[PDB]
Design a protein around this ligand. Structure first.
Ligand SMILES: Nc1nc2c(c(=O)[nH]1)N[C@@H](/C(S)=C(/S)[C@H](O)COP(=O)(O)OP(=O)(O)OC[C@H]1O[C@@H](n3cnc4c(=O)[nH]c(N)nc43)[C@H](O)[C@@H]1O)C=N2
Ligand SMILES: Nc1nc2c(c(=O)[nH]1)N[C@H]1C(S)=C(S)[C@@H](COP(=O)(O)OP(=O)(O)OC[C@H]3O[C@@H](n4cnc5c(=O)[nH]c(N)nc54)[C@H](O)[C@@H]3O)O[C@H]1N2
Ligand code: SF4
Ligand code: SF4
Ligand code: SF4
Ligand code: SF4
Ligand code: F3S
Ligand SMILES: [Mo]
Lengths: 329, 895
């Protein structure tokens, strides 16, 4: 497989993601405008808790156990959601009566369960989880590809599926535990997030990062000690990878949400528990989140007393260049 | 490896996807408040994509604005090549609303409008023609096209600030300004923020990053929303009262602050009216005319504790400013003419409490009391936290702690929105929010104040926009009050009985006595209706009354639009307007202090024209319709104006000087102190910041915050009292029981069990982007309406079922999203989807009537007078109550 000279790394701040779906649109309006790509959202944001995109992708299968490769399910098209199509021209211009209904009958969609979450009023809880290709150090897709069509670049660690070597084996879609490769039924090929390597080769951050409206996306190379990505992952150690039990070691990381109101007791008074259950942040990111929440909580208390906290200043990112590769283009 | 890796050759398939041969500056001209700077990327004459330019010069020590943008803006080019786009002028051949058209030439379509327009002036009146074009800050050149057109032919324009409910009606009553707020960068300067009926995670997307970054910088945020909305997941405190009961929460917070002596007494003595003396006999302000012969009715008294004598406060309505200034649009009077430090408290010590005796001309002594005294006595009795707990559903101790925290943190700031402004009694509610701000003394301080955020409603360079839109004078222009306009011509039944609130009495007396307008005059019907840059029919409250009663009264309805919206679908002629990336226009907002713009990435597509060039093309057809019909000049006695329709094009262009889109845009900048010196080329390169503002001096590197001309420079407030006026001793205010801030329970005239909420969704900018295919695939395929499972379960309603909402005004059938964050007893349908979307009948506005608060009709009380978008009836709709039923005509299974 070979190891790359540099590994491009992302950090998503779940304390700032507003779930506005801008990163989703910027990726789709740039990379997934092609034939057979209408259902593919390489960059997608989903509500946690929820079933995600595609539906139930966390029980799908793939990644690694005991160093051993698992072949999970190939999600049917209904789990990704049939993209709704409409006959506007008939109603608006051609005098055809009847509402412009979506086809098919809505039963699934990438963002179907937006802000439903879990828990009863007044303790309902949810937050947003922007997902993408993790560009893992142990890519399970690359490992499964029996044509060796996928490859990991030596320059920036990005994983790209070679569209000429790809013969449609779909083994990458079986063995990826994040369901980020998508089989294109019109080209009989697998398409996936390309990590914006044409933009990074020119020194411009990825579209999901550069166009992140919530100002929650971080990008850079972890070998650079001046990158906020390094400081959040290596120095302050508040950024964790999504689902590390898959054994793939992702290269995109998450700061767990420390903002949020507390559980409301039956008398209306607040308790110590936040509305976001720790048991859920554990199920997503493992056992370290409790220590990370304490570091974030402790450092935010410093700012509340008018004191200094360099970890907060990294998350705040008063200047976008302190956050990412230059987003100007 | 040589110098390129094994696969560099093929990877050009991806490098070519992110390529272009042309980059231009583009903006999205929708009522969004974003105004975000973008770059447009074209290749081979085809716009490929758009992206935030991220070129706003940051302010020191505060996070930068960039990237800005949103999910709708990053696919705004879908309206260039999508199936909704109008390509040619369309003439209706079927019935209104059927979508049965015949393609027509511009000449045929512009002749037909010119023929009917000239007919309407001749046989009826010029004010039977009207033009509706909203929020000029979004596209001021396009706004000025149809308004300048109506300006010279005699048609009447409309209002929108109030008709939408964006107008902080309670702020104009208190401060005498049209409405102002700090730019969102100053949210970072705050220590305690209250998101009060505001959901900025969905409704302030390009600006919402300052809130979380403030909390990561030590600040605290509170969310006051009946539902656990998207923004609440980040705040530190969540208060969820019953819908519309926020006034009882605010007044109970004032009680605690006043009882526990937490307020800024000096700020109260200087900048407020609570020290003004009120007579205990007539409940009126004690006036100079009451005590001194030849005294002014617009001069009052406070009691000075330093001298033990009554003193006339300085700068009220009867006090003139020596050397006057010109009237300012966003002010009741031009108090900027007064010298600096005019209302400086100095050595004065106005008493806030106490009883005193004053004796008048007539011989009798009367007991007088300061406004702060009467308010305190009513707060201690009526507005205790325990009594507010039984009204709002928020515990008295949570109410007490919220008040102690709001008064202690400095600075503290209230950010309110549609959740608190779109109620029938939202004026008295914002007055309660201004009282809480006045008590804490945070108005005019960075990180403090009472800040409102609604539509894109602040054109800072209003003077230059006035010059392009109404060249011969805003006093030589007809305006209707569109909330009144719709209510009357659509023959709305607002379900409010006359013995409770006699709306018809207040409405008619206001009109026949000149306080509010009613056009067309003499009771004539409206006949011609120009709709562009707004989806008037789809967004209109009282929509079912409009379709049945007003819409038939119009003989010609023209819609100039880039797409086929619901208004154009029900129109007689639809004209294609150029896309945002095909036109030249300015674009500004109140959320940040920069001038954004759009420029043509390519030529206007198909047969489309820009709004400015459309009304110029129609001006020449009307020039010749008048020639043919021998009605070229006519006398308009309302302004003593012999109009010349034969020379309309020269009046539209200043004899050709403003014939082109960039010329009119430069004319706006050249005639306003906020932007003079800025040219189009400067804006084409980098977004330029304003050079001045409205109610404060704009300072380099410091976020703007309003009202600092009065709180810092001590110029009088443009109110009848010259101060922040909380006592409004008008007859109509006594009748409604709101002479002071107090709790007014929401309207229950709709005898139905569910309160009907309709907030704004992150998935669209009003009706625009509702029918965007990418937006619908990011939801459930169509419109949505939300219920709590505690209400849907006894009704047999499952998630994604069709549900049926109705009251006496209409009925809507829509698919439901059951949400645990939804509060029981209320249902939230994201406001105004297009009628042709996934709705089985009607829309959100079918269940909404048009209601008029009599306090919004007052036009003879100092700073309370009609000015287009400065005062007038608000188009509230959050009091609406509906019933919910499961629609069983279709029950699809889920799998
Ligand atoms: N129950 C309830 N009711 C409510 C509300 C609520 O909260 N609850 N909200 C209110 C409020 S506050 C507002 S601001 C209205 O929704 C605003 O709607 P508006 O028609 O102005 O813009 P919209 O986005 O809808 O449509 C704008 C039209 O203009 C087109 N357009 C946009 N740009 C241009 C242009 O440059 N030139 C031309 N000729 N047209 C352009 C646009 O396509 C759309 O048709 C009102 N109703
Ligand atoms: N994507 C997008 N953004 C927008 C807009 C858009 O159309 N699309 N519209 C813009 C403009 S024109 C507007 S006016 C603003 C409106 O946007 P907002 O200021 O956010 O107002 P709303 O969305 O109507 O309601 C805000 C929250 O207050 C809740 N609420 C309802 N009633 C009450 C009440 O009585 N008391 C309290 N405390 N809360 C209540 C509502 O449920 C909601 O969660 O947003 C602007 N931003
Ligand atoms: S853009 Fe930034 S904030 Fe909006 S969703 Fe994607 S990540 Fe979360
Ligand atoms: S994320 Fe899924 S696809 Fe992207 S690299 Fe890791 S495994 Fe292969
Ligand atoms: S990085 Fe480039 S490719 Fe990977 S998701 Fe964000 S946008 Fe789509
Ligand atoms: S839509 Fe409104 S907010 Fe989103 S980008 Fe265009 S302007 Fe900025
Ligand atoms: S397994 Fe390999 S062959 Fe293509 S379909 Fe997947 S990349
Ligand atoms: Mo609005």
């Amino acid at each position: 497989m070979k190891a790359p000279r540099r590994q491009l790394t992302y950090v998503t701040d779940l304390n700032k993601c507003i779930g506005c779906q801008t990163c989703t649109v910027a990726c789709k309006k740039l990379w997934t405008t092609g034939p057979g790509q209408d259902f593919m959202y390489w960059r997608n944001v989903e509500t946690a808790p929820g079933l995600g995109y595609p539906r139930n992708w966390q029980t799908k299968g793939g990644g690694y156990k005991n160093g051993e490769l698992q072949k999970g399910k190939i999600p049917p098209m209904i789990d990704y959601g049939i993209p709704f199509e409409f006959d506007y021209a008939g109603r608006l211009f051609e005098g055809k009566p009847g509402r412009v209904r979506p086809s098919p009958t809505p039963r699934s969609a990438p963002n179907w369960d937006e802000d439903q979450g879990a828990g009863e009023y007044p303790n309902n809880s949810f937050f947003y989880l922007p997902r993408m290709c993790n560009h893992c150090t142990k890519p399970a897709c690359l490992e499964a590809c029996p044509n060796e069509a996928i490859y990991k670049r030596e320059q920036d660690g990005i994983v790209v599926i070679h569209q000429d070597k790809c013969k449609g084996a779909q083994a990458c879609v079986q063995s990826c535990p994040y369901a980020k490769p998508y089989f294109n039924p019109l080209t009989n090929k697998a398409n996936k997030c390309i990590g914006c390597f044409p933009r990074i080769e020119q020194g411009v951050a990825p579209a999901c990062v550069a166009q992140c409206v919530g100002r929650a996306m971080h990008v850079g190379f972890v070998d650079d000690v001046n990158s906020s990505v390094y400081k959040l992952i290596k120095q302050y150690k508040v950024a964790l990878p999504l689902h590390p039990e898959f054994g793939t070691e992702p290269n995109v990381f998450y700061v767990p949400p420390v903002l949020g109101p507390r559980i409301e007791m039956a008398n209306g008074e607040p308790s110590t528990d936040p509305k976001i259950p720790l048991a859920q942040l554990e199920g997503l990111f493992g056992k370290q989140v409790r220590d990370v929440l304490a570091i974030l909580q402790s450092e935010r208390e410093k700012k509340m007393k008018g004191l200094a906290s360099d970890l907060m200043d990294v998350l705040i990112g008063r200047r976008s260049t302190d956050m990412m590769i230059s987003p100007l283009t | 490896i040589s110098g390129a890796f094994e696969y560099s050759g093929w990877e050009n398939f991806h490098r070519t996807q992110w390529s272009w041969d042309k980059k231009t500056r583009g903006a999205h001209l929708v009522n969004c408040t974003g105004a975000c700077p973008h770059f447009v990327y074209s290749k081979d004459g085809v716009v490929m994509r758009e992206e935030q330019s991220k070129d706003i010069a940051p302010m020191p020590n505060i996070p930068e604005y960039n990237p800005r943008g949103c999910n709708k803006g990053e696919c705004g080019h879908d309206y260039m090549y999508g199936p909704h786009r109008i390509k040619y002028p369309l003439i209706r051949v079927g019935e209104r609303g059927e979508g049965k058209w015949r393609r027509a030439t511009w000449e045929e379509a512009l002749d037909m409008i010119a023929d009917k327009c000239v007919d309407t002036i001749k046989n009826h009146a010029p004010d039977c023609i009207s033009v509706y074009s909203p929020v000029p800050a979004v596209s001021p050149v396009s706004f000025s096209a149809g308004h300048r057109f109506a300006h010279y032919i005699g048609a009447h324009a409309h209002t929108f600030y109030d008709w939408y409910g964006d107008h902080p009606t309670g702020q104009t009553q208190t401060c005498g300004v049209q409405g102002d707020t700090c730019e969102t960068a100053d949210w970072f300067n705050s220590k305690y923020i209250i998101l009060w009926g505001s959901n900025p995670t969905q409704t302030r997307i390009p600006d919402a990053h300052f809130l979380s970054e403030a909390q990561l910088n030590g600040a605290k945020i509170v969310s006051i929303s009946p539902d656990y909305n998207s923004s609440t997941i980040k705040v530190d405190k969540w208060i969820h009262p019953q819908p519309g009961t926020d006034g009882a929460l605010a007044m109970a917070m004032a009680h605690v602050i006043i009882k526990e002596k937490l307020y800024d007494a000096h700020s109260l003595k200087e900048q407020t009216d609570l020290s003004y003396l009120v007579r205990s006999d007539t409940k009126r302000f004690l006036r100079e005319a009451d005590v001194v012969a030849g005294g002014s009715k617009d001069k009052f008294y406070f009691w000075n504790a330093k001298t033990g004598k009554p003193v006339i406060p300085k700068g009220s309505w009867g006090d003139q400013p020596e050397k006057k200034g010109s009237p300012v649009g966003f002010l009741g009077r031009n108090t900027f003419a007064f010298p600096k430090g005019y209302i400086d408290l100095g050595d004065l010590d106005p008493a806030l409490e106490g009883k005193f005796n004053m004796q008048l001309l007539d011989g009798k002594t009367v007991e007088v009391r300061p406004v702060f005294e009467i308010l305190k006595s009513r707060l201690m009795a009526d507005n205790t936290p325990e009594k507010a707990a039984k009204i709002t559903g928020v515990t008295a101790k949570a109410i007490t702690e919220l008040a102690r925290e709001f008064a202690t943190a400095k600075p503290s700031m209230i950010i309110c929105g549609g959740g608190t402004q779109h109620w029938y009694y939202s004026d008295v509610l914002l007055r309660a929010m201004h009282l809480l701000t006045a008590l804490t003394g945070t108005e005019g301080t960075n990180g403090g104040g009472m800040n409102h955020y609604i539509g894109q409603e602040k054109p800072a360079f209003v003077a230059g926009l006035v010059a392009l839109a109404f060249p011969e004078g805003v006093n030589k222009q007809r305006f209707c009050q569109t909330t009144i306009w719709t209510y009357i011509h659509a023959e709305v039944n607002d379900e409010i009985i006359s013995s409770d609130i006699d709306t018809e009495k207040y409405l008619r007396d206001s009109i026949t006595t000149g306080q509010m307008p009613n056009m067309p005059e003499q009771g004539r019907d409206p006949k011609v209706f120009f709709v562009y840059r707004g989806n008037w029919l789809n967004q209109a409250k009282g929509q079912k009354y409009v379709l049945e009663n007003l819409w038939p009264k119009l003989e010609l309805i023209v819609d100039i639009n880039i797409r086929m919206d619901s208004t154009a679908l029900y129109s007689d002629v639809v004209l294609p307007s150029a896309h945002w990336y095909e036109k030249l226009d300015l674009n500004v907002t109140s959320e940040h202090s920069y001038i954004n713009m759009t420029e043509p990435a390519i030529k206007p597509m198909w047969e489309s024209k820009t709004d400015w060039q459309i009304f110029l093309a129609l001006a020449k057809r009307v020039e010749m319709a008048a020639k043919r019909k021998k009605y070229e000049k006519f006398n308009d006695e309302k302004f003593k104006w012999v109009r010349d329709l034969s020379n309309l094009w020269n009046q539209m262009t200043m004899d050709g000087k403003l014939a082109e889109d960039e010329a009119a845009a430069q004319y706006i900048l050249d005639n306003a102190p906020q932007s003079k010196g800025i040219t189009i080329q400067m804006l084409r390169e980098k977004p330029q910041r304003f050079k001045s503002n409205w109610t404060s001096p704009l300072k380099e590197g410091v976020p703007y915050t309003p009202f600092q001309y009065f709180v810092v420079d001590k110029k009088p407030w443009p109110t009848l009292t010259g101060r922040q006026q909380f006592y409004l001793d008008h007859d109509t205010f006594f009748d409604m029981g709101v002479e002071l801030p107090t709790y007014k329970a929401p309207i229950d005239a709709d005898k139905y069990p569910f309160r009907f909420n309709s907030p704004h969704s992150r998935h669209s900018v009003h009706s625009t982007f509702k029918d965007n295919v990418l937006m619908l695939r990011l939801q459930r395929g169509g419109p949505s309406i939300e219920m709590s499972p505690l209400d849907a379960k006894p009704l047999g309603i499952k998630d994604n079922d069709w549900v049926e909402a109705w009251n006496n005004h209409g009925k809507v059938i829509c698919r439901v999203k059951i949400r645990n964050g939804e509060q029981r007893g209320r249902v939230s349908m994201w406001h105004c989807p297009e009628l042709y979307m996934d709705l089985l009948t009607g829309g959100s506005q079918s269940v909404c009537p048009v209601r008029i608060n009599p306090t919004n009709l007052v036009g003879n009380y100092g700073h309370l007078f009609f000015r287009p978008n400065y005062y007038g009836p608000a188009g509230s709709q959050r009091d609406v109550r509906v019933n919910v039923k499961r629609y069983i005509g279709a029950t699809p299974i889920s799998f």
